[PDB]
Curated annotation (Swiss-Prot), chain A:
Subunit annotation: Homotetramer or heterotetramer of pore-forming glutamate receptor subunits. Tetramers may be formed by the dimerization of dimers. Interacts with EPB41L1 via its C-terminus. Isoform 3 interacts with PICK1. Found in a complex with GRIA1, GRIA2, GRIA3, CNIH2, CNIH3, CACNG2, CACNG3, CACNG4, CACNG5, CACNG7 and CACNG8. Interacts with CACNG5 and PRKCG. Found in a complex with GRIA1, GRIA2, GRIA3, DLG4, CACNG8 and CNIH2.
Post-translation changes: Palmitoylated. Depalmitoylated upon L-glutamate stimulation. ZDHHC3/GODZ specifically palmitoylates Cys-39, which leads to Golgi retention and decreased cell surface expression.
Family to which this protein belongs: Belongs to the glutamate-gated ion channel (TC 1.A.10.1) family. GRIA4 subfamily.
Note on domains (UniProt): The M4 transmembrane segment mediates tetramerization and is required for cell surface expression.
Full protein name: Glutamate receptor 4
Intramembrane segments of this protein: 21-36, 37-39
UniProtKB/Swiss-Prot annotation, chain B:
Modifications after synthesis and translation: Palmitoylated. Depalmitoylated upon L-glutamate stimulation.
Expressed in which tissues: Detected in cerebellum.
The protein, known as: Glutamate receptor 4
Binding-site list for L-glutamate: E21
Note: The postsynaptic actions of L-glutamate are mediated by a variety of receptors that are named according to their selective agonists. This receptor binds AMPA (quisqualate) > L-glutamate > kainate.
Subunit structure of this chain's protein: Homotetramer or heterotetramer of pore-forming glutamate receptor subunits. Tetramers may be formed by the dimerization of dimers. Interacts with EPB41L1 via its C-terminus. Isoform 3 interacts with PICK1. Found in a complex with GRIA1, GRIA2, GRIA3, CNIH2, CNIH3, CACNG2, CACNG3, CACNG4, CACNG5, CACNG7 and CACNG8. Interacts with CACNG5 and PRKCG. Found in a complex with GRIA1, GRIA2, GRIA3, DLG4, CACNG8 and CNIH2.
Organism domain of life: Eukaryota
Gene: Gria4
Family, per entry: Belongs to the glutamate-gated ion channel (TC 1.A.10.1) family. GRIA4 subfamily.
UniProt comment concerning the protein's domains: The M4 transmembrane segment mediates tetramerization and is required for cell surface expression.
Localization annotation: Cell membrane; Postsynaptic cell membrane; Cell projection, Dendrite
UniProtKB/Swiss-Prot annotation, chain C:
Function description: Regulates the trafficking and gating properties of AMPA-selective glutamate receptors (AMPARs). Promotes their targeting to the cell membrane and synapses and modulates their gating properties by slowing their rates of activation, deactivation and desensitization. Does not show subunit-specific AMPA receptor regulation and regulates all AMPAR subunits. Thought to stabilize the calcium channel in an inactivated (closed) state.
Protein family membership: Belongs to the PMP-22/EMP/MP20 family. CACNG subfamily.
Full-protein positions shown: 7 to 212 of 323
Protein name: Voltage-dependent calcium channel gamma-2 subunit
Membrane association type: Multi-pass membrane protein
BP-aspect Gene Ontology terms: eye blink reflex; membrane depolarization; membrane hyperpolarization; nervous system process; neuromuscular junction development; neurotransmitter receptor localization to postsynaptic specialization membrane; positive regulation of protein localization to basolateral plasma membrane; positive regulation of synaptic transmission, glutamatergic
Places the protein is found: Membrane; Synapse, Synaptosome
From Swiss-Prot, chain E:
Cytoplasmic membrane side: 4-9
Role summary: Ionotropic glutamate receptor that functions as a ligand-gated cation channel, gated by L-glutamate and glutamatergic agonists such as alpha-amino-3-hydroxy-5-methyl-4-isoxazolepropionic acid (AMPA), quisqualic acid, and kainic acid. L-glutamate acts as an excitatory neurotransmitter at many synapses in the central nervous system and plays an important role in fast excitatory synaptic transmission.
Tissue expression per record: Detected in cerebellum.
Lipid linkage positions (S-palmitoyl cysteine): C3
Entry comment on modification after translation: Palmitoylated. Depalmitoylated upon L-glutamate stimulation. ZDHHC3/GODZ specifically palmitoylates Cys-3, which leads to Golgi retention and decreased cell surface expression.
Residue window of the full protein shown: 609 to 706 of 902
Family: Belongs to the glutamate-gated ion channel (TC 1.A.10.1) family. GRIA4 subfamily.
Native species: Rattus norvegicus (Rat)
Intramembrane segments: 1-3
Protein name: Glutamate receptor 4
General remark: The postsynaptic actions of L-glutamate are mediated by a variety of receptors that are named according to their selective agonists. This receptor binds AMPA (quisqualate) > L-glutamate > kainate.
Length: 83, 49, 180, 39, 98
């Protein structure tokens, strides 16, 4: 909802919208980014790109933490099986 | 009583272990509902007379 | 037309939900004391943002206060005690509704509607911080209560109003382009 | 055994995210405000 | 790997959005479970001393019936060995060889 806002709020760019980041597409681009998936669009503005950048960093950490913590669960569970 | 000790193992959902004579531990392991196990070697040695 | 109707109703709902949340006391169903010998007894309690009200035992209904203060750790406790962010969302949602009301009166200044959009979007962001700062400071079982869910639900109802307001701004400026 | 990561562990990634969203809107609004003073 | 064209409708996106969640978990389970294999099997310590055998119950150990290698455990006052004597005595099948 922040990505959509920035991209489409300003009325000095609607020469036909300025980009393709509408509300519906914004959800799609934020779900795709989180799932480390492919591309359909990429922000071309400054404000929009800031949101993208922080979102990509958030995903990285979170996705890394999941995998990292998942291995911990498996390894600790696989080493404990009882003197 | 030991009977209480055995019942406490069976009702505690994996969160209690009971220390007792090997003879009793072995007997219960062969009784229905077959939900207990003896683990480890004996800690000491004695006899009945 | 009907789009403005949703915004108004949705804005009121968001505001109402959040206010109940803050004011109520059913945020964290924990198990603690509610009374300031050398004895004690922990019974199930339904905590809140300000008071820890017991719901079981001989002290059923006694609402004690919470000593949030029993430099990273200090800052967290300081913010969590005053509820700056949760209360800030209340202030922002209230202000965002005034703007929508001000619209009908001043129908020649499109920036009245876009202001509501920013307040509502920014009100949601404050709500997120409040949830995070309440779950981090708070950390034997727990289960959040209906009051905590009115906060979370308010966020959603405030982000949806936010996008709706931004569409109204966009849409209005689109009609101006046509007239030009 | 192991525990499940709590919000307290991954806490600075939601402040950055929320802080970044705030910064993004600010940049956008200042650009729009500047353009609105140039008309 | 793969980024060319993505769905653009509501129905197609729903399909692609659950598929994306599926892949994430599945591709994070392989890596995570693979690490456990490469970690658990690395931590494994090769058999050493007698204390290790006493704790273990998988690999059986047996002395000879008549000789000094059985008297030593029978009379041993060391717990790490006294434990083994008790098991080896009544254990079946008889590990004691001829």
């Amino acid at each position: 909802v922040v990505l959509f806002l920035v991209s489409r709020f300003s009325p000095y760019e609607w020469h036909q919208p300025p980009n393709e980041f509408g509300i519906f597409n914004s959800l799609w681009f934020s779900l795709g980014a989180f799932m480390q998936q492919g591309c359909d669009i990429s922000p071309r503005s400054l404000s929009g790109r800031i949101v993208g950048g922080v979102w990509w960093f958030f995903t990285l950490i979170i996705i890394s933490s999941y995998t990292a913590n998942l291995a911990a669960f498996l390894t600790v569970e696989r080493m404990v099986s009882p003197s | 009583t030991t009977a209480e000790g055995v019942a406490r193992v069976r009702k505690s959902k994996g969160k209690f272990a009971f220390l007792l004579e090997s003879t009793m531990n072995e007997y219960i392991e062969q009784r229905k509902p077959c939900d207990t196990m003896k683990v480890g070697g004996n800690l000491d040695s004695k006899g009945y007379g | 037309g009907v789009q403005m109707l949703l915004t108004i109703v949705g804005a009121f709902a968001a505001f109402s939900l959040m206010t109940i949340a803050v004011g109520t006391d059913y945020w964290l169903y924990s198990r603690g004391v509610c009374k300031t010998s050398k004895k004690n007894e922990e019974v199930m309690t339904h905590s809140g943002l300000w008071r820890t009200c017991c719901l079981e035992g001989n002290f059923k209904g006694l609402c004690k206060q919470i000593d949030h203060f029993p430099t990273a750790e200090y800052f967290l406790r300081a913010v969590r005690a005053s509820s700056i962010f949760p209360i800030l969302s209340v202030i922002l949602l209230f202000m965002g509704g005034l703007c929508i009301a001000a619209s009908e009166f001043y129908k020649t200044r499109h920036n009245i509607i876009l202001s509501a959009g920013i307040f509502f979007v920014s009100a949601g962001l404050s709500n997120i911080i409040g949830i995070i700062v309440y779950i981090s400071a708070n950390a034997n079982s727990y289960s959040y209560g209906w009051s905590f869910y009115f906060g979370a639900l308010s966020f959603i109802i405030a982000e949806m109003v936010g996008v709706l307001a931004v569409h109204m701004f966009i849409d209005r400026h689109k009609q101006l382009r046509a007239t030009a | 055994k192991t525990s499940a990561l709590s919000l307290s562990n991954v806490a600075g990634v939601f402040y950055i995210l929320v802080g970044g969203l705030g910064l993004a809107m600010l940049v956008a609004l200042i650009e729009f405000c500047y353009k609105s003073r140039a008309e | 790997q793969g980024c060319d064209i993505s769905p653009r409708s509501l129905s197609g996106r729903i399909v692609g959005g659950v598929w994306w969640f599926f892949t994430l978990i599945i591709i994070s389970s392989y890596t995570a479970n693979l690490a456990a294999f490469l970690t658990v099997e690395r931590m494994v310590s090769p058999i050493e001393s007698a204390e290790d055998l006493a704790k273990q119950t998988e690999i059986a150990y047996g002395t000879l019936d008549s000789g000094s290698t059985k008297e030593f455990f029978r009379r041993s006052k060391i717990a790490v060995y006294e434990k083994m004597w008790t098991y080896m005595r009544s254990a079946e099948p008889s590990v004691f060889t001829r």
